[PDB]
Design an enzyme around this catalytic site. Structure first.
Site, mmCIF file in Angstrom:
data_model
loop_
_atom_site.group_PDB
_atom_site.id
_atom_site.type_symbol
_atom_site.label_atom_id
_atom_site.label_comp_id
_atom_site.label_asym_id
_atom_site.label_seq_id
_atom_site.Cartn_x
_atom_site.Cartn_y
_atom_site.Cartn_z
ATOM 1 N N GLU A 43 0.834 -1.194 0.000
ATOM 2 C CA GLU A 43 0.000 0.000 0.000
ATOM 3 C C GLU A 43 0.871 1.248 0.000
ATOM 4 O OE1 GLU A 43 -1.417 0.839 3.826
ATOM 5 O OE2 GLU A 43 -2.859 2.371 3.206
ATOM 6 N N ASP A 108 12.673 5.835 14.141
ATOM 7 C CA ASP A 108 12.679 7.262 13.853
ATOM 8 C C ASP A 108 13.461 8.007 14.925
ATOM 9 O OD1 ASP A 108 12.263 9.711 12.732
ATOM 10 O OD2 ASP A 108 10.075 9.699 12.906
ATOM 11 N N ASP A 110 14.882 12.214 15.697
ATOM 12 C CA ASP A 110 14.662 13.584 15.252
ATOM 13 C C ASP A 110 15.366 14.566 16.177
ATOM 14 O OD1 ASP A 110 13.526 16.066 14.232
ATOM 15 O OD2 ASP A 110 11.947 14.822 13.349
#
Lengths: 419, 76, 65, 121, 241, 181
Positions: A43, A108, A110
């Site tokens: 997807e 992740d 950051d």
């Protein structure tokens, strides 16, 4: 050079027409075709011009994917999980029989999780002083995932502005449930607590091997990054905020020592001496015997997000995208030369477009009378630009995956004892 | 008397029944032409109406409607 | 004191099928045409003799099932 | 929008006359329901021979399976390495008492009319 | 000896389904008794802290009152074990509709199995492990001394060089989730090294949870055939009692 | 030669204009739109304005103002928009006399029957009547009336499939109307 966003659409069209590596992309996202209908169920979710968000997208083969990106020219591209049915026909199935099955584990990191620890930059800016934080985070996470867990294939992708992603694309990792992913994320976290808590690290008397090895890794970078560049002991407020994590019985002594001290190195030595002296007088105290290690962990350890990895149908930015603001490329990071990785040297879309224009101008007098297919033209275009080493790294990772698949097939044949 | 088209619980019930899919159903009809074969009066020229499909009215020549009479009605 | 219609249907069908298979094997017949399939040629059918009314059987009210 | 489901007799599907990925709608009589792997086996009797159709029903559970009842399966055909061909059912409805010869006659009539209409081009 | 062969141990993994015929009244009574036992277990777990003495004493009293199998006696334990087996299967049939009900049922079953395992003798633990399908691997003494410091540093309920007179087990990291979650086990190249007590408790609980979840998911496909006019009021009442 | 379409003034003379035509879904998708007036199509010269289809629902999509369905007629798949009728100003029931109470009970029963009749899920059989429209380069039917066909033996669809070729041959494959002979 300063990026002008008004010129974005033409460069985006040229990049998606000539430089985007569709072949390597399809080679990665197919995993050799061992399982029937694997890429047909992946997807995607594109973002069109003027903030139009559409998800539940799927494609049949490489040519259709090329045509779709060429026609739509999306600003952002994302990759989802493999479902039990084609996502674009998700309404032709009885409700409850359309569930996500497999997705590679992701991570992740950051800048925005360090605004209260760093002072070199302001808000959402990056300078060569604060990239050592991501260097240490990369090394710690990679060592943990290679030794403690044993995950072979890993891809580290520069997010474009301030972060790095980690695509773990092994064979048994993809089938893991959400609970095991949450357990992994909890196992790989030390800095825990809300905003209102000042001391976010608490180390017990016994030290886990993972924490010990992370501390041993940190020590090689802590001095230069902290005392020299960051200068976390320059002013009154600096050691005042540092003093919030030390025992309350030595506030005046440490303040007097820091007033006596001159540079950050002297203050650090004085703090080490004070902590060592106090460690011999610790008898049922809240503060542990590892003040220095706690400070180092609070000021250097990476902080991960549990929401990105806990879900099994999450979305993340795909490699080789274009940042809408700065205009860079989500280039893969080589692990062998992670120290020399300079974020400001990442090629921009405008620069590679200019290089492509120069290459075409040279080909007007160097490569003439050649009736080659568009595939070879695009291959030459992305080979002769600044994007070549990054696609080379991608190809090396794909070769590693192919070797692993071949070895697994050979092991299966040996189990079957048929050749 | 109800005039749905053309120039109270009972009324509401009849109105609901006359528009529900319980009435608008496929049937098998045995009909007889209303104008008897003996009668002779052919004098009808085509009319002209203003059907409007795509927000663009147009004019067409339409035939007069067929009038029938029922003799038996059965389900199917 | 516990009976269900599908059990009776299964028993009757099994009896009919077994007896018909034995008869066909003994008599060397090719195939059995379905009851509802129309044809213009002679056909061989298998079934159970029954009556369409609640009264006694007669030579005018016989139905093959 | 999914591809249309054209009709196919069981002895045409079982004979490998349908290309891969084609959408088909067939019929047969249920025989088995292996709940562990969610697989259903159907046969239709043609003359004196029996042909089998395998249907994977991973998208229609939960299911009430009656042994010995006619079924109509609509789905996409997929060729497998060892299990031959299996139909991934999307809609699996139960019909009992259908007049099969009438259905086959209607199918042949529809095919004949389609051939006649296509004979002018 | 069918009696002891059918039910040799108080602990079970509930693998074999029952195969005998019982009356409706006993069916209903067993279902009600087991749902009451599950609710009592949940309330006792919430009210007190797991372990201690009062909690286990009250749990033992509750188990004894509802004529179930909790202890180990050499004489006349066929009836409680049979009742436990049949009642558990009936409750599994009744509790396979939604995700929340499945989660609650699995939680209560795990707690009950944990208690019954905690009240078991050591040789009985070994025999029960042998009886079920689980097979474990024990590392050699050379390996044990090769990785002593790391195991002691991880301290999986081991203090002060207590590695001696213990057997260290090697298991995949995906099965030790409870200990793996909070840094209570030493991980190396995809395997977890666990002492005996922690390995048996946690790994048995996790394997039981996985097997029960898979089997409840399989049994979810069944009630589409439960069109019987009987057992329907009982199932409906028990679903939202 | 490009076959010139029938003039827009003589369209009403065809009997098929005002009748719900029975057509294959493939035909519905393949007919060529008329240039004179959008929304009215042509099939062998016949100006067709409304259609009638019967098939199996393969997909249900719902928005705030309308439903969407996919009707499969074993020849093609087309969408079928079904608009939502607003139930504004619902009829208020009152404890009137016994005869009126019985009438209100019968009205409630009829309402329940209608609501049951209009409930559709995946796998059922639906009959859709309405007019063809084009929206964003897609052809779809804006349903006027629609209900769920209760067909437990598969007789209705068999009859439809046996009947359609005969109606095609005897009516639709014929030249034109009779306009002033």
């Amino acid at each position: 050079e300063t990026f002008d966003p008004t010129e974005l659409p033409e460069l985006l069209k040229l990049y998606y027409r000539r430089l985007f590596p569709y072949s390597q992309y399809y080679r990665w996202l197919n995993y050799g075709g061992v399982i029937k209908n694997y890429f047909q169920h992946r997807e995607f979710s594109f973002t069109l011009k003027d903030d139009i968000y559409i998800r539940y997208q799927s494609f049949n083969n490489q040519s259709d994917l090329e045509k779709e990106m060429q026609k739509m020219n999306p600003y952002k591209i994302d990759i989802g999980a493999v479902y039990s049915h084609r996502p674009n026909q998700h309404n032709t199935v009885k409700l409850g029989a359309f569930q996500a099955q497999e997705k590679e584990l992701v991570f992740d990191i950051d800048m925005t999780d360090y605004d209260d620890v760093r002072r070199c930059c302001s808000s959402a800016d990056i300078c060569p002083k604060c990239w050592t934080l991501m260097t240490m985070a990369i090394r710690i996470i990679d060592r943990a995932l290679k030794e403690d867990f044993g995950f072979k294939h890993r891809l580290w992708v520069y997010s474009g502005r301030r972060g790095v992603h980690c695509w773990v694309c092994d064979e048994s990792v993809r089938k893991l449930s959400s609970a095991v992913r949450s357990g992994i994320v909890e196992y790989l976290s030390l800095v825990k607590g809300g905003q209102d808590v000042k001391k976010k690290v608490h180390l017990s008397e016994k030290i886990h091997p993972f924490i010990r090895k992370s501390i041993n890794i940190i020590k090689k970078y802590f001095e230069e990054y902290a005392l020299v560049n960051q200068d976390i002991l320059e002013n009154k407020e600096s050691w005042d905020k540092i003093l919030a994590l030390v025992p309350e019985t030595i506030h005046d002594e440490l303040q007097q020592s820091f007033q006596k001290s001159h540079n950050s190195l002297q203050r650090w030595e004085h703090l080490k001496k004070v902590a060592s002296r106090y460690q011999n007088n610790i008898k049922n105290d809240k503060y542990g015997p590892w003040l220095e290690w706690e400070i180092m962990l609070q000021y250097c350890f990476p902080r991960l997000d549990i929401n990105v990895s806990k879900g099994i149908n999450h979305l993340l930015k795909s490699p080789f995208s274009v940042h809408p603001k700065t205009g860079r490329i989500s280039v893969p990071i080589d692990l062998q030369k992670v120290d020399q990785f300079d974020p400001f040297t990442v090629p921009t879309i405008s620069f590679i477009c200019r290089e492509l224009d120069a290459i075409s101008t040279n080909e007007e007098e160097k490569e003439e009378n050649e009736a080659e297919s568009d595939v070879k033209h695009r291959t030459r275009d992305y080979k002769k630009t600044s994007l070549a080493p990054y696609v080379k790294v991608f190809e090396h990772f794909l070769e590693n995956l192919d070797k692993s698949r071949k070895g697994e097939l050979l092991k299966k044949s040996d189990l079957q004892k048929d050749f | 008397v109800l005039q749905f088209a053309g120039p109270e619980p009972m009324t509401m019930f009849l109105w609901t029944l006359c528009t529900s899919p319980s009435v608008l159903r496929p049937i098998v009809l045995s009909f007889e032409l209303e104008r008897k074969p003996s009668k002779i009066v052919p004098l009808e020229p085509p009319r002209l109406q203003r059907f409007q499909c795509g927000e663009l009215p147009f004019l067409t020549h339409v035939n007069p409607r067929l009038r029938l009479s029922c003799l038996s009605i059965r389900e199917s | 004191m516990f009976q269900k219609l599908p059990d009776i249907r299964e028993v009757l069908t099994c009896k009919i099928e077994e007896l018909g298979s034995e008869l066909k094997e003994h008599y060397k017949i090719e195939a059995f045409t379905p009851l509802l399939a129309p044809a213009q040629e002679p056909v061989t059918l298998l079934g159970q003799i029954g009556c369409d009314s609640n009264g006694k059987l007669n030579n005018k009210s016989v139905i093959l099932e | 929008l999914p591809k249309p489901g054209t009709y196919y007799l069981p002895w045409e599907v079982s004979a490998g006359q349908v290309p891969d990925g084609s959408t088909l709608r067939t019929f047969g009589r249920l025989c088995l329901y292996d709940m562990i792997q969610s697989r259903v086996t159907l046969m239709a009797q043609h003359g004196s021979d029996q042909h089998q159709v395998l249907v994977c029903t991973k998208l229609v559970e939960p299911f009430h399976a009656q042994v010995g009842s006619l079924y109509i399966v609509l789905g996409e055909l997929q060729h497998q390495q060892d299990r031959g061909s299996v139909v991934k059912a999307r809609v699996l409805t139960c019909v009992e008492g259908m007049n099969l010869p009438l259905l086959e006659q209607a199918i042949r009539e529809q095919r004949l009319y389609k051939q006649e209409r296509g004979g002018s081009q | 000896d069918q009696r002891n062969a059918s039910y040799p141990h108080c602990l079970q993994f509930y693998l074999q389904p029952p195969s005998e015929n019982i009356s409706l009244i006993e069916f209903e009574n067993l279902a009600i008794d087991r749902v009451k036992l599950l609710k009592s277990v949940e309330n006792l777990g919430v009210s007190y802290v797991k372990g201690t003495e009062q909690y286990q004493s009250k749990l033992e009293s509750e188990l004894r009152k509802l004529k179930f199998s909790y202890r180990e006696n050499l004489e006349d334990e066929y009836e409680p074990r049979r009742r436990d087996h049949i009642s558990h299967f009936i409750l599994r049939l009744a509790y396979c509709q939604s995700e929340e009900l499945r989660r609650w049922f699995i939680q209560q079953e795990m707690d009950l199995l944990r208690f019954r395992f905690s009240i078991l003798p050591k040789d009985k633990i070994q025999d029960f492990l042998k009886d079920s399908q689980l097979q474990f691997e024990a590392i050699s003494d050379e390996e044990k001394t090769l990785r002593e410091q790391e195991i002691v540093a991880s301290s999986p309920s081991l203090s002060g060089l207590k590695l001696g007179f213990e057997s260290i087990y090697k298991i995949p990291f995906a099965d030790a989730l409870d200990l793996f979650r909070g840094r209570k086990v030493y991980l190396e190249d995809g395997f977890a090294y666990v002492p005996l007590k922690d390995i048996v408790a946690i790994i048995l609980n996790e394997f039981r949870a996985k097997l029960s979840k898979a089997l409840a998911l399989t049994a979810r496909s069944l009630p589409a055939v439960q069109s019987d006019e009987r057992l329907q009021p009982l199932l409906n009442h028990l679903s939202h009692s | 030669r490009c076959e010139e379409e029938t003039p827009s003034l003589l369209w009403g003379l065809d009997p098929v204009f005002l009748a719900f035509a029975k057509l294959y879904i493939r035909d519905i998708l393949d007919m060529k739109e008329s240039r004179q007036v959008p929304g009215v199509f042509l099939y062998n010269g016949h100006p067709i304005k409304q259609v009638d289809v019967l098939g199996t629902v393969i997909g249900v999509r719902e928005r705030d103002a309308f439903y969407s369905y996919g009707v499969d007629d074993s020849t093609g798949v087309i969408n079928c928009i079904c608009w939502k009728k607003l139930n504004t100003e619902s009829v208020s029931a009152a404890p009137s006399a016994a005869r009126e109470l019985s009438l209100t009970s019968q009205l409630k029963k009829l309402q329940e029957t209608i609501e049951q009749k209009t409930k559709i899920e995946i796998g059922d059989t639906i009959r859709v009547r309405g007019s063809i429209r084009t929206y964003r380069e897609e052809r779809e039917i804006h349903a006027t009336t629609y209900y769920k066909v209760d067909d437990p033996v598969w007789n209705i669809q068999i009859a439809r499939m046996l009947e359609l070729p005969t109606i095609y041959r005897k009516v639709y494959d014929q030249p034109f109307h009779s306009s002033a002979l």
